[PDB]
């Protein structure tokens, strides 16, 4: 039952959700009003980043006190990302070291 | 110039990128081989989460030593997310407190 001033979750992609507040389009700044958007979008204000964007109604769901479903989902993905960076940097060097080692063996 | 065993960045959505390694489809497990996917996808292995998925060639870019563009982009978005959660929880309570206060005034 979406409405202006409501706190909501916005799907930014399949692996990214973000809390925001739905804006009345009559209330946002002129330069936000004039941003091209798809017919039937409404504006939200994203917390943390503090910027406005027009969004599809299909990508916006109510923020419900207590239900940390979206929040915990996001933080635990975001945490794993750190591990992912170190693993990839590690794998990248091993693979590079192998490539370099074979290359060295091909040069007299 | 993508190839098997290459370390890459995968766009999971517009606000999510993830490091992975491209797999030879002949080398991944049977149950990954048999997962329905779009024609012209290839499999990657995602670091951190350690799971395989079939991806569109258009969403995969080389991981380049030194170029922390994707990495820094992701972590700084991921950091802001924390601020976003606290801001939204704060705003949600204020708005709720207002709604509750008006409701109280309407009941004798």
Q: What is the CA radius of gyration of chain B?
A: 22
Cβ within 8 Å, pair A19-B80 = no
- Method of elucidation: X-ray
Resolution to one decimal, Å: 2.1
H-helix or E-strand containing B53? strand B51-55
Find the CB nearest A63 among B18, B74, B88: B88
Measured at the CA of A57, the angle between CA A55 and CA A63, to 5 degrees, comes to: 90
Task: Please name the residue ranges forming H helices in chain A.
Answer: 30-33, 69-106
CB atoms within 10 A of CB B28: 17
Using an 8 Å CB-CB cutoff, list chain B residues near A46: 84
Q: Which of A24, A88, A91, A99 to mutate to test the interface with B (most CBs of B within 10 A)?
A: A88
Give the span between the Cα atoms of A20 and A99, in whole angstroms. 47
Displacement of CA A64 from its chain's centroid (Å): 19
Cβ within 8 Å, pair A84-B49 = yes
Give the span between the Cα atoms of A62 and A8, in whole angstroms. 4
Using an 8 Å CB-CB cutoff, list chain A residues near B8: none
What DSSP state is assigned to residue B23? Answer: P
Residue A75 near residue B81 (C-beta atoms within 8 A)? yes
């Amino acid at each position: 039952k979406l409405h202006y001033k409501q706190i909501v979750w916005v799907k930014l992609g399949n692996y990214r959700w973000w809390p925001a507040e739905i804006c009345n389009p009559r209330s946002v700044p002129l330069n936000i009003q004039g941003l091209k958007h798809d017919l039937g979008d409404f504006p939200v204000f994203f917390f943390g980043s503090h910027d406005y964007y027009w969004v599809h109604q299909g990508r916006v769901f109510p923020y419900v006190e207590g239900d940390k479903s979206f929040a915990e989902g996001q933080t635990s993905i975001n945490k794993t990302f750190k591990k992912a960076l170190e693993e990839a940097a590690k794998r990248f060097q091993e693979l590079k070291a192998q490539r370099e080692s074979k290359e060295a063996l091909e040069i007299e």
